[PDB]
Structure 1
Amino acid sequence: ESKQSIMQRILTVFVFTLLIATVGLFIGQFVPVALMLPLSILEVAMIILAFWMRRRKAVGYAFVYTFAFVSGITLFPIVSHYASIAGAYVVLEAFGSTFVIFAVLGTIGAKMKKDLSFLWSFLLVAVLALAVVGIFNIFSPLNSAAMMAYSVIGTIVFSLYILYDLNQIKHRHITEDLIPVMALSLYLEFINLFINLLRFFGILSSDD
């Protein structure tokens, strides 16, 4: 029963989900395109069960590891897209840039003394704000100027979320059965930041 023990276990499962998502990303290149949408709907259902439903018992380890593998498969269409227009190295550039932001802002938030719970209103509303223009991009693609602003704001908002989330892990009372869902949260914050950085470096290193 210590914060130094739980935070090490949460970050251990968090690294496992990144490795599992990397395997699913490698497997995802063989998955047909028609299966990407059903698997995406499967992820949305899993996210609602994990966070948005009032459940008595938190999600287990098999649920988070399964989501990480399925999430890695559906990341291939966007990873391969920006690898075609910007290069295969840009994907590693944005993947590495996500780690240094996760490490810098994650360590600062976890080591912070201030309780940043009051940012819940601004960050939830900021993510909802970014989610609305994301739906607009699905049905109608944004130009280079607006997509750049969407990726830059997305990088700033989801970086602040990593600072807020890991700061709340220290300040809030985390139990033993919350390790999977909290590691799933850190995985989703990693993916959202990775996608925006992949868009940021993709447009910056693109031919148009």
Structure 2
Amino acid sequence: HESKQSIMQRILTVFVFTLLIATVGLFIGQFVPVALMLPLSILEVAMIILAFWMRRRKAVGYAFVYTFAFVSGITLFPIVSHYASIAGAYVVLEAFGSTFVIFAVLGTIGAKMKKDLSFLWSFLLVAVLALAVVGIFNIFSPLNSAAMMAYSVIGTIVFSLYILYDLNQIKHRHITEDLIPVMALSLYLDFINLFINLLRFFGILSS
């Protein structure tokens, strides 16, 4: 008979582990040749769909989440190498550090506060819709410095709020032990998205 404390603890452990794994994948990524990046990104989107938007009998398991962390780490390499090339590695490290303390603080606040933040879920989803939209727009019509910078500020705010919300709902919602992997996956996505936004912002700012 698990308790909520143990469930949250296990979720956070898996989260940390996905961080380490994604880091291994990121390291691995510097030897991954281009054109494999496309099918890997495709696999990434398909896995996101299978895990979140597809009414399945059984929820996503540990193998799924850890594999995703690996591949995701690999695929965030061009982003990292790019911004490191124009801003330097220390900026990447500082962005990771920033993401880290933001996640720790906002996560602790979300998890330990008594209010139920289950009302802004629609607002948050809407925000993510916007960010994804301008993100796709960026592919066909690349944004300038100021624009990408603004997009990064908004992204930062949004995903920070999403971290707060997610830990809050992990505390408040009825989370069974079979949802542990997909919750940890959610925290991973929060982290990675915040990180990409911060890295983009400071990376551009330092060039």
TM-score when scaled to structure 2? 0.98
CA shift for structure 1 position 141:
1.4
CA RMSD of the aligned region, Å? 0.6
Q: Give secondary structure in 2 for the equivalent of 1:115.
A: coil
Match of 1:203 in 2: 204
Structure 2 CA distance for aligned equivalents of residues 76 and 33 of structure 1: 11
Q: Tell me the residue number matched to 2:184.
A: 183
Give the corresponding residue for 2:111: 110
TM-score normalised to structure 1 length: 0.98
Structure 1 stretches of 4+ with a deviation exceeding 2 A read none
Q: What is aligned with 1:30?
A: 31
User: Shift of residue 101 of structure 1?
Assistant: 0.5
- Output aligned runs, 1:10-159, within 5 Å: 10-159=11-160
Counting matched residue pairs gives 206
Q: Percent identity?
A: 100
Gaps of 5+ in 1: none
Q: What's the CA shift string for 1:85-112, capped at 9, x where partnerless? A: 1001111111110010100100000001
CA distance in 2, matches of 1:140, 1:33: 22
Cα distance in structure 2, aligned partners of 1:103 and 1:92: 16
For residues 132-187 of structure 1, give each alpha carbon's deviation from its aligned partner in whole angstroms, at most 9, with x where no partner exists: 00001112211011111000000000000000000000100100111100000000
What's 1:172 paired with?
Answer: 173
Q: 2: distance between equivalents of 1:63 and 1:192?
A: 19
**Cα distance between partner residues in 1 of 2:77 and 2:105:** 27
Rounded to whole Å, the distance in 2 between the matches of 1:183 and 1:17 is 8
Take 1:92 and 1:156, find their aligned partners in 2: how far apart are those partners?
A: 20
Which secondary structure does the structure 1 equivalent of 2:120 belong to?
A: helix
1:171-207 Cα shifts (integer Å, max 9, x gaps): 001001111000000000001000000011101111x
The alpha-carbon deviation at position 30 of structure 1 amounts to 0.4
Report the Cα distance in structure 1 between the residues aligned to 2:141 and 2:90, rounded to whole angstroms: 28
> Secondary structure at 1:118's aligned position in 2?
coil
Between the aligned partners of 1:90 and 1:151, the Cα distance in structure 2 is 15
> Could you list the per-position Cα deviations for residues 9-64 of structure 1 after superposition, in whole angstroms to 9, with x for gaps in the alignment?
00000000000000000000000111101000000000001111111111110000
Q: Say which SS state the counterpart of residue 135 (structure 1) adopts.
A: helix
Q: CA deviation at 1:82?
A: 0.2
Q: Hey, what's the Cα distance between the residues in 2 that align with 1:34 and 1:56?
A: 34
Residue aligned with 2:26, SS: helix
* Distance apart, 1:119 and its partner CA: 0.5
